[PDB]
Design a protein around this ligand. Sequence first.
Ligand SMILES: *[C@@H]1O[C@H](CO)[C@@H](O)[C@H](O)[C@H]1NC(C)=O
Lengths: 51, 51
Amino acid sequence: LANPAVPWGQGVEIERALKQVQVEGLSGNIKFDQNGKRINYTINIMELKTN
Amino acid sequence: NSIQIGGLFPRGADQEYSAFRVGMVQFSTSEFRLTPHIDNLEVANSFAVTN
Ligand SMILES: *[C@@H]1O[C@H](CO)[C@@H](O)[C@H](O)[C@H]1NC(C)=O
């Protein structure tokens, strides 16, 4: 809360590090855009049947 | 008999602070006097509001 707030430099680097990640996981292909949202995901479309 | 009251005016709010001061002039009394501390901020910013 100290004013004026000062951010560390390293943070941006860690951010870019996280956003540049592409890995394989339980959610399928995991990759992010510049803003941090998910990209290239796959959502299985399913229907409930008798069985 | 000093009463400290904080206030938050979004940057670009002019007539509002004007009416605030006019109100301060009209409703002032001998009994007690309000002592405002005005703070301009980015009203949409949560960090700014918290701070
Ligand atoms: C990955 O996402 C980008 C962004 O829409 C798209 O252009 C590309 O075709 C995607 N790749 C696959 C294999 O779906």
